[PDB]
Amino acid sequence: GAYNEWKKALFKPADVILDPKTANPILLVSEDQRSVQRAKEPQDLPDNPERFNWHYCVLGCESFISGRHYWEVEVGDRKEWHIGVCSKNVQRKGWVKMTPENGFWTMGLTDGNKYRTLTEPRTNLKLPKPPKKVGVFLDYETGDISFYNAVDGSHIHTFLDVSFSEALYPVFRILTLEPTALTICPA
Ligand SMILES: C/C(=C\COP(=O)(O)C(Cl)(Cl)P(=O)(O)O)CO
């Protein structure tokens, strides 16, 4: 609605491209670095320090330490996906639960129709329609991370008044083998 339109006018549109050096080896990062898909088997890649070696995650190339930013992600009909932001210093080696206290502010979909916010404990979301494009608002100084349906502007979830102390990266996670990719909408 009009509030979402006000916010998109205030917040700076971010041009997010995926960083292949961060992507778990089971992930396929597209050549234009806008899309991510899951491979049948892990790729033969180094275990460089930037790479998630357990979680099926990939980061954007640029992080945020200030300001108001937003980007939109086409999830389409994909039956499983989680997106949001995470701190630069999240645990990338070995499993960690993706939670705000561990530096992840994310939400998404499992099993086709189970929407969750990845809070601790996880919160189930009641969405009136399944989103096909999802917008992410980041307001660094106030500490707000918000998710919205990018087509009709309706609300999905707000993380409210977080105290950020690190740079923040867009983060993307996909677990399933299925033909629909995740694609970032360009700024
Ligand atoms: C197997 C993987 C994620 C499953 O995540 P996970 O076991 O941490 C969970 Cl089931 Cl706790 P989540 O979906 O609630 O985060 C690889 O990224």
Author numbering: 297 to 483
Paste lines from the article.
Vγ9Vδ2 T cells—a major subtype of human circulating γδ T cells—respond to multiple cancers and infectious diseases in an MHC-independent manner; they are specifically activated by small, non-peptidic diphosphate metabolites called pAgs. The sensing of pAgs in target cells requires a surface protein, BTN3A112–17, that has both intracellular and extracellular domains. Here we show how—in both humans and alpaca—multiple pAgs function as ‘molecular glues’ to promote heteromeric association between the intracellular domains of BTN3A1 and the structurally similar butyrophilin BTN2A1.
The relatively weak activities of PCP analogues can also be explained by the molecular glue model, as their enhanced pKa values lead to reduced binding to the basic residues of the butyrophilins.
